[PDB]
Amino acid sequence: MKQYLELMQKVLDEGTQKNDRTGTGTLSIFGHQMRFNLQDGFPLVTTKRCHLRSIIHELLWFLQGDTNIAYLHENNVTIWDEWADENGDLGPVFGKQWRAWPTPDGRHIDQITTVLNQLKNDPDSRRIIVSAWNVGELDKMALAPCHAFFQFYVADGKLSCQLYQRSCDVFLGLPFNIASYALLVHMMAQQCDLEVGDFVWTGGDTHLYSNHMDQTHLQLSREPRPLPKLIIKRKPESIFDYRFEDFEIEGYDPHPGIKAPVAI
Amino acid sequence: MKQYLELMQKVLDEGTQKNDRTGTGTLSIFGHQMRFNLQDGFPLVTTKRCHLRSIIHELLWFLQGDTNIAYLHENNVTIWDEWADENGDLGPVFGKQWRAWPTPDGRHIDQITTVLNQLKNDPDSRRIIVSAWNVGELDKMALAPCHAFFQFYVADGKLSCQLYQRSCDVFLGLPFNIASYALLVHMMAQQCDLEVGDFVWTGGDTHLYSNHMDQTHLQLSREPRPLPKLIIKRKPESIFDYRFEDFEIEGYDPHPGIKAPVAI
């Protein structure tokens, strides 16, 4: 997509050499923002083929609130295997905070239900927020949330969402981060009888790994194709009742897939 | 400042009519970002005179962690009086979360000490974060935090900070929000033997109140003046030992002050 390739070029041009926790090198910038008008099309990167199978299962899994990887394994989704313990546990990552944020007084707060009802009853609200950044729970998490905090907004019948992503792997992660939250906005808008607005992406440490440079150069040589279209095949009774098969992408004509590694 | 006036003009041009919780009208946009290179000068709005007295006391008060307004009243700082109860209490707002975030297991987490030591020991970290958005504590707060979440970053000997502000009163609040966090970056950089980098400001619901329109039109007719310079007159032994008198602004030649109201 235009904004995505512009980000990649910016990191190339302006990024500074910066290492990650393993010692693996990157080029990094701090602070960036992009906006995707969801009525223009579904913002799935076209300059390489991006598969959404794991991303859809992951989002349904987040929304279900159980952080054991059993559901992912039931569907042969393996993207959290690296972080899970022998029993398949991850600690109180994403879904536990979205659905059952623990409080000092022993309650567990369902932020997703909170937001859905704010959107339906008080759409002007300036505090329609979900946070995964539960400071007390960070140490028990397999890793701290990268997509940490998000806010919804309603105007002129349209639902928008802004994500704050503290750390972003531009090449491997970001295409998927965009698609995941764009899907969530479509699901929430359907459930609230709203049209889709903008997905606004905001980054903190936004980086290209040094061993993604060949891939980045190739991708920047390609012209974006028309955005595809998301089809939701059925309207479920709530935000918690979506199924994998409810989602189809039409009109997706990407350039070929581009593989990239990780260090250990 | 250029970026500030550009934001104001954007809200004028592109903002949509949107009411707040009291029913007071605004023009609103969702999602914006600005960057202030702190080596260029201290980013204090010059197109109207902005007083920093209350803002400096407020920041020292945040850093001290006690949310009773007694310290503010000791200095005749009245900007939190509206929200305080008969005993001067605000509930677990800002400073309580910065210095003593309560956890389910009964601990209280000092996020400011955490960050200072991350900056000194693990400056490459992508999770140097302070959050005020303690979901369990929102209901006891006098109001939910507007400046909700911030992240630090180090590269090339320079400390940067990004703020996520969920709700922003562009005319009355934003000049002060910018100055408060810019001061904090200077204080933290001094304590970590770092130079100052960028303050990156990110907004959610970013709005101009309808009864600030006369003022906005006047302000947009003025040309920004050179940025002033922050002087820290003494290096304290830690981030918790700063005093009001340690701070001076030099070279501040603003256009006259512009008064603006609020509804009740």
Nearest to B104 among A19, A102, A156 (CB): A102
Give the CB-side neighbour count of residue A92, counting CA atoms within 13 A: 19
CA A206-A161-A159 angle, 5° bins: 155
Is A146 annotated as catalytic? yes
DSSP code for B104: T
Q: Which residue of A has its CA nearest to B36?
A: A31
Strand duo B101-102 + B229-232: pairing:
unpaired
Q: Which residues pair with B27 in a beta bridge?
A: B17, B208
Q: Which residue of B has its CA nearest to A129?
A: B166
Element (H, E) at A153: strand A147-155
Contact (CB, 8 A) for A165 and A177:
yes
Contact (CB, 8 A) for B155 and A18:
yes
Rounded Cα distance, B125 and B151, in Å: 10
Identify the burial level of B259 via C-beta atoms within 10 angstroms of its C-beta, where 0-12 means exposed, 13-18 middle and 19 or more buried. Answer: exposed
Element (H, E) at B44: none
Nearest to A151 among B18, B135, B204 (CB): B204
Please give the interface size between A and B, counted as residue pairs whose CB atoms are below 8 Å apart. Answer: 141
DSSP code for B214: H
Nearest to A33 among B31, B111, B133 (CB): B31
Rounded Cα distance, B62 and B172, in Å: 20
Which residues in chain A are contacts of B104 at CB distance < 8 A?
A: 102-104, 106, 136-137
Element (H, E) at B258: none
User: Which residue in B205, B206, B207 has the most chain A C-beta atoms within 10 A of its own C-beta, making it the best mutation to test that interface?
Assistant: B205
Rounded Cα distance, B36 and B42, in Å: 9
Q: What is the DSSP string of A44-87?
A: ---SS----HHHHHHHHHHHH---STHHHHHTT--TTGGG--TT
The 10 Å CB-count burial string (b at 16+, else e) for B92-108 is: bbbbbbbbbbbbbeeee
**Closest CA–CA distance from residue B75 to any residue of chain A (Å):** 31
Contact (CB, 8 A) for A262 and A23:
no
Q: Is B136 helix (H, G, I), strand (E, B) or coil?
A: helix
Rounded Cα distance, B186 and B188, in Å: 6
CB B166 to CB A127 under 8 A? Answer: yes
Which residues in chain B are contacts of A202 at CB distance < 8 A?
A: 31, 33, 164, 202
CB B126 to CB A20 under 8 A? Answer: yes
CB A28 to CB B164 under 8 A? Answer: no
Rounded Cα distance, A103 and A116, in Å: 21
Place of tokens 């595809």: A228
**Alpha-helix runs per DSSP H in chain B:** 2-14, 53-64, 70-74, 94-100, 111-121, 174-191, 213-220
Give the C-alpha distances (Å, rounded to integers) separating B89 from A46, A183, A223, B80, B191.
54, 42, 58, 10, 31
Rounded Cα distance, B107 and A102, in Å: 13
Token pair of B165, please? Answer: 């502000």
Which residues in chain A are contacts of B133 at CB distance < 8 A?
A: 129, 131, 133, 149
Contact (CB, 8 A) for A102 and A110:
no
Long-range Cβ contacts of B172-176 (<8 Å, 24+ apart): B172/B209, B172/B212, B172/B260, B172/B262, B173/B146, B174/B4, B174/B7, B175/B4, B175/B44, B175/B45, B175/B48, B175/B50, B176/B50, B176/B55
Rounded Cα distance, B110 and B91, in Å: 17
**Closest CA–CA distance from residue A152 to any residue of chain B (Å):** 9
Q: What range defines the domain where residue B220 resides?
A: 2-264
The 10 Å CB-count burial string (b at 16+, else e) for B1-12 is: bebbbebbebbe
Give the C-alpha distances (Å, rounded to integers) separating B40 from A181, B137, B198.
36, 38, 10
Q: Enumerate the known binding-site residues of A.
A: 21, 51, 126-127, 166-169, 177, 207-209, 263
Which of the residues A50, A146, A161, A192 is marked catalytic? A146
Q: Is A214 helix (H, G, I), strand (E, B) or coil?
A: helix
CATH number for the domain spanning B28: value is: 3.30.572.10
Q: Which amino acid is present at A41?
A: G
Deposited experimental method: X-ray
Domain count, chain A: 1
The backbone torsions φ and ψ at residue B92, rounded to the nearest 5 degrees and listed phi first, read -80, 55
CB A131 to CB B131 under 8 A? Answer: yes
Q: Which of B17, B59, B53, B26 is nearest to B167 (CA)?
A: B26
Which residues in chain A are contacts of B101 at CB distance < 8 A?
A: 135-136
Q: Which residue of A has its CA nearest to B33?
A: A33
